[PDB]
Amino acid sequence: DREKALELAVAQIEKSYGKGSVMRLGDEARQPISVIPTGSIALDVALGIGGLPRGRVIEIYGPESSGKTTVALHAVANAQAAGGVAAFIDAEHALDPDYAKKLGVDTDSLLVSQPDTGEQALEIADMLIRSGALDIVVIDSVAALVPRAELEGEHVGLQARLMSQALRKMTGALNNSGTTAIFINQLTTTGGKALKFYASVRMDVRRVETLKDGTNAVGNRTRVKVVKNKCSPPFKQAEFDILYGKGISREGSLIDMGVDQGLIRKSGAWFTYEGEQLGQGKENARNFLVENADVADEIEKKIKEKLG
């Protein structure tokens, strides 16, 4: 009786409001056709559907130099890598393309708009989404989008009304086109509370601690926290390594989820995969896996097989 009334109830909530309106936190996720891998299996896993969804607004947010921008450029890198077309609306004026190319972005064929207002930024994105040619669009950033009025001189609050209007319209078209939009935001105090509710995924990117290679300390350890997720149970979280100049370590992530899933064995500062030995201490095993793509792809597919 109690279950049937609950499963019935829950089923009607989905009928009238859609997919992830209600979920238990332990539930398995659905499994979409295609998603955009994040660049880290950990964050792919934490997201529950093995990557960022499509036809969705996505908010990545954190403080100055947290990594978010990198996380976003890997979404672009992967979207393109599968022959997708990308776009980048830029209000910050801080994109380093040399760094982008190192993560794997195809800057040469990356669409860039550097608009002159918030009105323009969004209307261009809106116009570009309806072409149905783009897979992903990034908008750096929500803070920098300053409304026409404010730029001309002519009471505040007009930015939040802008973000709200724009999203309502844009939210429709995204689900039709199968495009993904990423808004990068900083820390309606930073723009609009609207993004918070239109977003189907919201990631909280922070910097946990600085990595060090003994002397000459490279990279930072990042921690995304998936505070909202309509495509899968939320409040999951992932840590990974962003290395200066290289970005997210795909290999370093495979090791961590490796040992975690019991596929890899830490004997004693010694990393073992399935009889053979990978290296001595993470930075070796990582630098081994990067030299050997064959063993890297295998580990990835096995962890995925083992989950989704």
User: Is 172 known as a binding-site position?
Assistant: no
Q: What angle do CA 206, 212, 218 make, to 5 degrees?
A: 75
User: Is 147 known as a binding-site position?
Assistant: no
Residue 185 gets the label, from left (phi > 0), alpha (psi -120 to 50) or beta, of beta
Listed in sequence order, the residues at least 6 apart from 289 whose beta carbon sits closer than 8 Å to its beta carbon are 251, 254, 255, 278, 295, 296, 299
What is the resolution of the experimental data for this entry, in Å? 3.4
Total number of residues shown for the chain: 308
For residue 215, tell me if it sits in a domain: yes
Q: What does the alpha-carbon distance between residue 248 and residue 222 come to, in Å, rounded to a whole number?
A: 9
Two tokens at 264?
């890899």
CA distances in angstroms from 228 to 167, 199, 200, listed in the order given: 17, 8, 7
For the chain, the C-alpha Rg in angstroms (whole number) is 21
Same domain, 167 and 35: yes
Sign of CA dihedral 125, 129, 133, 137: positive
Residue that is written with structure tokens 């036809």 in the block: 55
Domain of 158, in residue numbers: 23-248
Contact of 146 with 103, CB cutoff 8 Å: no
User: Is 84 known as a binding-site position?
Assistant: no
For residue 16, tell me if it sits in a domain: no
Q: Estimate the crossing angle of helix 293-306 against helix 250-260, to 10 degrees.
A: 50
Same domain, 253 and 147: no
Domain boundary among 203, 227, 248: 248
Contact of 201 with 235, CB cutoff 8 Å: no
Contact of 170 with 56, CB cutoff 8 Å: no
Same domain, 186 and 127: yes
In the 3-class helix/strand/coil scheme, how is the chain assigned residue by residue? CHHHHHHHHHHHHHHHHCCCCCCCCCCCCCCCCCCECCCCHHHHHHHCCCCECCCCEEEEEECCCCCHHHHHHHHHHHHHHCCCEEEEEECCCCCCHHHHHHHCCCHHHCEEECCCCHHHHHHHHHHHHHCCCEEEEEEECCCCCCCHHHHHCCCCCHHHHHHHHHHHHHHHHHHHHCCEEEEEEECCCCCCCHHHHHCCEEEEEEEEEECCCCCCCCCEEEEEEEEEECCCCCCEEEEEEEECCCEECHHHHHHHHHHHCCCCEECCCEEEECCEEEEECHHHHHHHHHHCHHHHHHHHHHHHHHCC
Contact of 54 with 194, CB cutoff 8 Å: no
User: Is 253 known as a binding-site position?
Assistant: no
User: Is 67 known as a binding-site position?
Assistant: yes
Which residues, listed in sequence order, are joined to residue 90 by a DSSP beta bridge?
140
User: Is 63 known as a binding-site position?
Assistant: yes
Contact of 57 with 229, CB cutoff 8 Å: no
Residue 306: CATH number of its domain: 3.30.250.10
For residue 11, tell me if it sits in a domain: no
User: Is 59 known as a binding-site position?
Assistant: no
What is the distance between the terminal CA atoms of the chain, rounded to a whole angstrom? 33
Q: What does the alpha-carbon distance between residue 139 and residue 87 come to, in Å, rounded to a whole number?
A: 9
User: Which of 13, 18, 90 minimizes the C-alpha distance to 55?
Assistant: 18
